[PDB]
């Protein structure tokens, strides 16, 4: 998955969180939350095909914009009454949409929020663990390079002393 | 300031994960803020420097030991208790066959839970980004040295071949 902070136009004051889980080409789940409510939509490959056909765009580029847009200067839109989500690719004060998706309001949003925070805390734990091994490996590699430099200097010294 | 976010389970709500966020401006011993949240509501309490010393005294515990226990329990066997009707949070130390209360706190139901939850998530997302940056730099520094190693080793081997031939 990827969790991105976004601002909606209808609510520029606060930060929303866009959680996308999936390659995206084979349909995905998109979740929006403001820390209280949550909206979730499962986008099928069928629904994807119908969006790229309604706007006459290449699959690869379309998914590429999805990939470039959903995982993170794009703008994001969501109406809490119609529950339709869409984003635009902006360029030169000119913009166009990449389809819309329906995000149904979730009955028990606290479950989603809890899961999102747990995911982040688990990720932090995993990254710290990885860093501990990488620190040691980095230090070992620097030490081994120093050893080789000293070993190589010894060889050159022996060659030059040999010459004379 | 600094903070620590911990996952806990409550005796009275064993199924749901709660999050305990403890933060301090200077140091834990000089005052901290303790927030409990289930991802929907949040309760917060401020603990002053003098309240810590008074709690240690009421417990007939040496202040350093009391603070040491707060660190082990609130920053992360300890049990956590909270009731959404009393807004009263206490945790206990459980040794073999016996437990005892390690101080308690009265939390106040926050008025803006969503704001607190968003700020907490943002903190985690910022930490993930910083940790990913750190990993990327560590791995590049390691890989850069390995490349220099392999380059230097080409010369080392040639010098060995030259020296072996000359000393042969």
Residue numbers in the entry:
A (entry chain B): 3 to 24, 27 to 76, 83 to 174
B (entry chain A): 1 to 76, 83 to 174
Q: What did the article's authors report about this structure?
A:
Microtubule (MT) nucleation is regulated by the γ-tubulin ring complex (γTuRC), conserved from yeast to humans. In budding yeast, homologues of the grip-containing proteins (GCPs) GCP2 and GCP3 (Spc97p and Spc98p) and two copies of γ–tubulin (Tub4p) form a 300 kDa complex (γTuSC). Spc110p, a distant pericentrin homologue, recruits this complex to the nuclear face of the spindle pole body (SPB), while Spc72p recruits it to the cytoplasmic face. In yeast, the CM1 motif is required for seven identical γTuSCs to helically assemble into a γTuRC at the SPB.
Motivated by the crosslinks observed between the Spc110pNCC and γTuSC, we sought a higher-resolution structure of the NCC region via X-ray crystallography. Previous work indicated that Spc1101-220 is only weakly dimeric. Using the proven strategy of fusing weakly interacting coiled-coils with stabilizing domains, we found that an N-terminal fusion of Spc110p164-207 with a domain from Xrcc4 produced high yields of soluble protein. The Xrcc4-Spc110p164-207 construct crystallized in a variety of conditions, diffracted to 2.1 Å, and enabled phases to be obtained by molecular replacement using Xrcc4 as a search model. As expected, the electron density map was consistent with a coiled-coil, with interpretable density for Spc110p164-203 residues. When the coiled-coil was docked into the 6.9 Å cryo-EM map using cross-correlation in Chimera, the X-ray model occupied most of the alpha-helical cryo-EM density. Importantly in the docked conformation the majority of the unique crosslinks were satisfied. Given the observed pitch of the coiled-coil in the crystal structure, as well as density for larger side chains, we were able to assign the register of the NCC. We observed a significant number of crosslinks between the N-terminal portions of Spc97p and Spc110pNCC. Thus, this region and not CM1 was responsible for the coiled-coil-γTuSC interaction apparent in the cryo-EM map.
